[PDB]
Amino acid sequence: IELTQPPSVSVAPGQTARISCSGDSLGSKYVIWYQQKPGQAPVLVIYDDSNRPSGIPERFSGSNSGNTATLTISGTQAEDEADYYCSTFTMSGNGTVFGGGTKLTVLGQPKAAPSVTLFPPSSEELQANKATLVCLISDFYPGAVTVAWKADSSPVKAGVETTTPSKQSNNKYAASSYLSLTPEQWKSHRSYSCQVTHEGSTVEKTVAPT
C-alpha cells in the first residue's frame, strides 16, 4: 500500500548503484521500475520484479524479497543520471502505487556539503501581521537535500514550501525553503531551526525571536 525509496543515491563512475524500495510484504507483490530524465516521460526499465524490456541494457536488473525491492545498475554511466521510481499494483481503486522516487547522481565532481543561511521574520513583516522564515541552501553537490523545520525541536509540518535544486553557475546546487508562521506562533516558541540533510549528513541553522 505504500512504497518507500531513499530520496537520493550517488555513485562514482563505473561503480554499482543500488536503489531500494520497501513496504509491508513487498516481496509478495510484483514490482515495476521506471527511469525518468529531466523534460521527459518515464521509461519502463524493469517489469515483473526483474524482467528487462528488450532494449534496456543488461546493466539494469531488479530483485525483490522480504520487504525490499532493489534496482541495481552495474558499471554505471553519466547517461544513467535520472530519477527512478518503483511501483506496484494496489487494490485502491484497483490502481497502481509509486514510490516517492530516487535521484541517481553519477559523481562528476567531489562531494560538497551545503551552506545554510537562516533569516528570521523581518520586523517590518511582523508589523504587517505575517511571518516568513527564509532558509537559503547553497553550494552543494550532489543536488539533493531533504529539509526539515523545527519549532523548539518539534517537527513543523504545515506552511513549509521548498524549491527543487537548481544548478549554480559553478555546477554545484542551490535551494531555498520558506516557513510561513503566525506572528504569535513565531513569538510563542523559543526558537525555530532549519535542518538540511545532504548525503546522509545534516547541517542545521537556528533563529530566535527578539
Binding site: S25, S28, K29, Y30, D49, M91
Partner: peptide, 10 residues
C-alpha cells in the same frame, strides 16, 4: 513460461 511467485492473499 516460468514461475509465478506466491502473492499472499492475492
Amino acid at each position: 513460461s516460468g514461475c509465478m511467485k506466491y502473492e499472499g492473499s492475492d
